[PDB]
Amino acid sequence: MTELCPVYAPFFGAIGCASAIIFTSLGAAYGTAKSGVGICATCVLRPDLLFKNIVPVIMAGIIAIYGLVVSVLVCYSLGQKQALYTGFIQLGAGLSVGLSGLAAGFAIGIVGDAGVRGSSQQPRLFVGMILILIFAEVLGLYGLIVALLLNSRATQDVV
Amino acid sequence: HAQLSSVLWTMTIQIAFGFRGFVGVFMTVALFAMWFALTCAVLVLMEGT
Amino acid sequence: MSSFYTVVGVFIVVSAMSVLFWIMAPKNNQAVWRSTVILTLAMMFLMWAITFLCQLHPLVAPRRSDLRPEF
Amino acid sequence: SFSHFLYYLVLIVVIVYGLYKLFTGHGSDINFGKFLLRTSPYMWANLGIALCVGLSVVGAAWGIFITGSSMIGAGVRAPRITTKNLISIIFCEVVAIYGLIIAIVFSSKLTVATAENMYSKSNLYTGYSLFWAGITVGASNLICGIAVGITGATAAISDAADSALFVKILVIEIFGSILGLLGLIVGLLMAGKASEFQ
Amino acid sequence: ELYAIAKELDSWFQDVTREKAIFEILNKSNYDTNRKILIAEGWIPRDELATLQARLGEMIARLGIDVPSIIQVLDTNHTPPTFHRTNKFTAGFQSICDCYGIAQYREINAGLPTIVTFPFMFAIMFGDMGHGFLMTLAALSLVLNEKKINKMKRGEIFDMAFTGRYIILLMGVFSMYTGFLYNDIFSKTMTIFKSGWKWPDHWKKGESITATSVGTYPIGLDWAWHGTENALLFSNSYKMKLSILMGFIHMTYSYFFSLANHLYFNSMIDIIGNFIPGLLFMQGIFGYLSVCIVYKWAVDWVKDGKPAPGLLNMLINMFLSPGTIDDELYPHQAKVQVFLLLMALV
Amino acid sequence: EKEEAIFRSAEMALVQFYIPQEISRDSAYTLGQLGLVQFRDLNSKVRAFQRTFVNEIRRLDNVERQYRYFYSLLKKHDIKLYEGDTDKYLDGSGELYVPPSGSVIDDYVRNASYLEERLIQMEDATDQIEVQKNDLEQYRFILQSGD
Amino acid sequence: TGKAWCCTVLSAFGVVILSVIAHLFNTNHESFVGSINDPEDGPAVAHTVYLAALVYLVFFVFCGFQVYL
Numbered sequence A: 001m002t003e004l005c006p007v008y009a010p011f012f013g014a015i016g017c018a019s020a021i022i023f024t025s026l027g028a029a030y031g032t033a034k035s036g037v038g039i040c041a042t043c044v045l046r047p048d049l050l051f052k053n054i055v056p057v058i059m060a061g062i063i064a065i066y067g068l069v070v071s072v073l074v075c076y077s078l079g080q081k082q083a084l085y086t087g088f089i090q091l092g093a094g095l096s097v098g099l100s101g102l103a104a105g106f107a108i109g110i111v112g113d114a115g116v117r118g119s120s121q122q123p124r125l126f127v128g129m130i131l132i133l134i135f136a137e138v139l140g141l142y143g144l145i146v147a148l149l150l151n152s153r154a155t156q157d158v159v
Numbered sequence B: 001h002a003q004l005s006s007v008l009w010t011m012t013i014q015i016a017f018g019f020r021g022f023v024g025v026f027m028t029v030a031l032f033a034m035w036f037a038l039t040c041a042v043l044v045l046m047e048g049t
Numbered sequence C: 001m002s003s004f005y006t007v008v009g010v011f012i013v014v015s016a017m018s019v020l021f022w023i024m025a026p027k028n029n030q031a032v033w034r035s036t037v038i039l040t041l042a043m044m045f046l047m048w049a050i051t052f053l054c055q056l057h058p059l060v061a062p063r064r065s066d067l068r069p070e071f
Numbered sequence D: 001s002f003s004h005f006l007y008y009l010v011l012i013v014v015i016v017y018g019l020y021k022l023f024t025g026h027g028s029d030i031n032f033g034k035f036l037l038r039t040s041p042y043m044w045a046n047l048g049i050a051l052c053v054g055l056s057v058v059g060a061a062w063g064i065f066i067t068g069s070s071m072i073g074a075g076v077r078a079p080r081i082t083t084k085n086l087i088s089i090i091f092c093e094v095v096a097i098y099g100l101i102i103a104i105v106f107s108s109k110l111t112v113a114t115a116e117n118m119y120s121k122s123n124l125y126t127g128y129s130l131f132w133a134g135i136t137v138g139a140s141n142l143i144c145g146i147a148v149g150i151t152g153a154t155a156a157i158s159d160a161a162d163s164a165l166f167v168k169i170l171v172i173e174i175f176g177s178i179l180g181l182l183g184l185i186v187g188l189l190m191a192g193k194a195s196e197f198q
Numbered sequence E: 001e002l003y004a005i006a007k008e009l010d011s012w013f014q015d016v017t018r019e020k021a022i023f024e025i026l027n028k029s030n031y032d033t034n035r036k037i038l039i040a041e042g043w044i045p046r047d048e049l050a051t052l053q054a055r056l057g058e059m060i061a062r063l064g065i066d067v068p069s070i071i072q073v074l075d076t077n078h079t080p081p082t083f084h085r086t087n088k089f090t091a092g093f094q095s096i097c098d099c100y101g102i103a104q105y106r107e108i109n110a111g112l113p114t115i116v117t118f119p120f121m122f123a124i125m126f127g128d129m130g131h132g133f134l135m136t137l138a139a140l141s142l143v144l145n146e147k148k149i150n151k152m153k154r155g156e157i158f159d160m161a162f163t164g165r166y167i168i169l170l171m172g173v174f175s176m177y178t179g180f181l182y183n184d185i186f187s188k189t190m191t192i193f194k195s196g197w198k199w200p201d202h203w204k205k206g207e208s209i210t211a212t213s214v215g216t217y218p219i220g221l222d223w224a225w226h227g228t229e230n231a232l233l234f235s236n237s238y239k240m241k242l243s244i245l246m247g248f249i250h251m252t253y254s255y256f257f258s259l260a261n262h263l264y265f266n267s268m269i270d271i272i273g274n275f276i277p278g279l280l281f282m283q284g285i286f287g288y289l290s291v292c293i294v295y296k297w298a299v300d301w302v303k304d305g306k307p308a309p310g311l312l313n314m315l316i317n318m319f320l321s322p323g324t325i326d327d328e329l330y331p332h333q334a335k336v337q338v339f340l341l342l343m344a345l346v
Numbered sequence F: 001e002k003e004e005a006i007f008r009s010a011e012m013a014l015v016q017f018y019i020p021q022e023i024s025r026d027s028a029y030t031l032g033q034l035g036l037v038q039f040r041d042l043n044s045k046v047r048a049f050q051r052t053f054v055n056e057i058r059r060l061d062n063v064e065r066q067y068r069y070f071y072s073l074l075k076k077h078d079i080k081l082y083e084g085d086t087d088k089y090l091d092g093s094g095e096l097y098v099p100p101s102g103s104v105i106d107d108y109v110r111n112a113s114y115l116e117e118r119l120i121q122m123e124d125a126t127d128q129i130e131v132q133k134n135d136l137e138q139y140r141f142i143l144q145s146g147d
Numbered sequence G: 001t002g003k004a005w006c007c008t009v010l011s012a013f014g015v016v017i018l019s020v021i022a023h024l025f026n027t028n029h030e031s032f033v034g035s036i037n038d039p040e041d042g043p044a045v046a047h048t049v050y051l052a053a054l055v056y057l058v059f060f061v062f063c064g065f066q067v068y069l
């Protein structure tokens, strides 16, 4: 009930922890769905590439790891009597990682679908597909990094 | 990489330390197996990719 | 304790080793040996020196509360 | 359309509420000034940082998939273009780099402030500056990433036909990246005078 | 009939493919109708020219047919092919450096510095002595057993990561080294040496305690930084400045290869117009940043009493407000900063 | 001594071969066995199907097509293909082997053509027998249905 | 026999890593029992991880014998 620690302060931390996994899971699901459509489309013609072309689905799932990591780390500083500064730090970290992971998952899904459909026809395109998928995943990595930077300040000098 | 490694250690092996007894030993074995699998899957292989 | 002169001495030792290897590098794959070993030593020293300078006179001291009073 | 009906209903409700407050003599009760003064500047700062990095990443991913789809599509017949058009993906990810840098710079200003000086002039200015500079950097990086992705898709499709097209569309792509660079410059300029919360 | 074919089809196919390849190569010859001479031009390295002459002499002796001078070296203005002799160790790195593009004739090879830089940048990003050890073991399994894997057939994912088995070995070794420099063994820390941080003599449980400096950690990050609240505030700055410094060094090393190329090709105008201006630009705008990063580490700001100058704010003010410095890193800072800005703008 | 061309590309000299047609096939064999010559396209000015050895390349392309058809027959009528002796040609290095004669290639071409004729005749006979047997099997099944 | 090799490798890595962890617990290492969040009883966790490493050693020797035959 303190001016520095309102009763609605835990709402921001809880909702940031929820969002960190919600948006990353949404992006990972979009990536997994699009890459699965691509893989199932290509495996009818080139079944030998079934296990090589699953990489987009794998890289879509790493976004979910980033969201889970941020959600786990946010719960560390969650509490009833936490400051509004800590709550908004948690919300900012959760929003950063969630939106970054959502964008990364969308990009991974689209580029992975394109790459799996274009690598069966041209095997030289697997390297390009992997490169662009890494470029899409490093965006979720950057969101993770910003979330970690915010979290490092969550419970420092807080009273 | 450092944060994922630390969080994986926290969620996989650090949990097994609290448990003791036969159930503690079984949980330690299973959790170490899961930790090693996740390591060699995402951190060594994929985060190393 | 130590100062930047420790990094200077390590740099002197690394440079001496690099020059010696350049002089005595084997004839077979001479360029490969020279480049690989010298550049490995160079970036190994560079990363170690950066890590050392970061902890020479740090502006941040390790702050924690979980440490048990026994330790 | 359900969305259009919702927007119209929201507009009608807002207008009716405003007219009801104004006519009854309580028009000043809809006070945006008190909303901005009584809102914690930590909210503005954290929302600005989060939206900066999020929208920068959204624009980077937007340009990345627009360029990558075209690169893979045109690479089926000309696989040689992927390595040469990777510069387009680099120009799409540099906006995410810009957003990350701006987020680091702004997070360097996230200091715990005392209760008495919670809503001081400097603290409120810092909150507003961080929020709006983060919004500016994020939206500019989003726009620049979309433009650079479109330009890179055109460049990949055109240099699949003839490699001489890439060296002339790279100029347009650099023009696009200049927008993100200017967005970063302006975002730094806004928060240059914004001191840490105290 | 088909089983009779199966015992000899492969040899017939190989013979027919060779017979078609030799005629496809002979198809690219300026035959003289009046004479009976097929004129063909090829790109053989100067090193094996004597070997080719000896082999053609051996062929002539085998056939016994007397012929005039069959080998005549030519000096033309064409672009010779780019051929680098690779071992089993440098083959993967050169495959990496040729996937991007093929170098010019007698151009500074990018595959020689890659051998070390690429695994070391991967190690900086990776940085783990336990995961690096796993990578080293995975690569050594291929390296020691490389004869058997060479003998046997390999898949697309197995041919890859085996042609680059030495790549993975170097990345694993360098990852182990960096993990030692990070003191990160399976996300834990090694207390090998004595920490430079001393905790207070006595404190209550749950009380925030700040360590006091006693020395410096010999090798790697201090292990007293493990689990502390401000561990991130130190490690992030350390790694950001490490990235900046090791990127500036790698960039200047790569840029000096442009000078090497220009010197080899006798392009002095290139040196004057693209190397020196760019070198001054990067050593005034970004080389200065690296020098300031190194210098700020070598100055005891608390002991000296001067405030710690924010290097990022200094870099921002170097362009957005010339001549204004909030914190003095070194004497005559503003003069040097405006001089370097003028150097870049010139 | 061979230059260790790792820092820069290997020094190259453009070499001209004055090969008479009397030993042209053997010279091409030796140059391909060496594997050290990247031949220039001296005859690029003329368009296709007009070059010096277009007919003899077409003949071997036809033989390769026939061998691919034989491989397709071996795959459809499941049969493991016996791999050839890679060590016979050394499949690399600068060593020279005794190359096949022109008469050997002519025998390969004539045998491939005649045996393709035999195989297509036998395959047509087998296909017609199989299709009529399949029709009779379907007729048997429809007669075997319940009342 | 791929499962046997995978289990052999995993169990050998278990015998190494868990034995190291239990030794560090038994010696009351700062990185393992040096925080209030970390387990208070060192020797108890050391014994538990000793038993886990013995289980992994049994698995390792069984799978190595299976691989050898």
Ligand SMILES: CO/C1=C\C(C)=C\[C@@H](C)[C@@H](O)[C@H](C)C/C(C)=C/C=C/[C@H](OC)[C@@H]([C@@H](C)[C@@H](O)[C@H](C)[C@@]2(O)C[C@@H](O)[C@H](C)[C@@H](C(C)C)O2)OC1=O
Pocket: A051, A052, A054, A055, A058, A061, A062, A064, A065, B040, B041, B042, B045, B046, E157
């Ligand atoms: C069922 O658990 C599997 C994946 C899950 C659920 C992972 C979660 C932790 C996920 O939430 C995380 C987020 C993503 C992750 C950690 C993926 C790693 C997958 C494994 O990869 C090592 C494959 C891998 C064994 C398998 O996919 C293939 C057989 C393959 O081995 C075929 C190879 O040809 C190919 C080279 C290789 C490459 C693509 C990695 O994959 O295990 C699985 O399926």
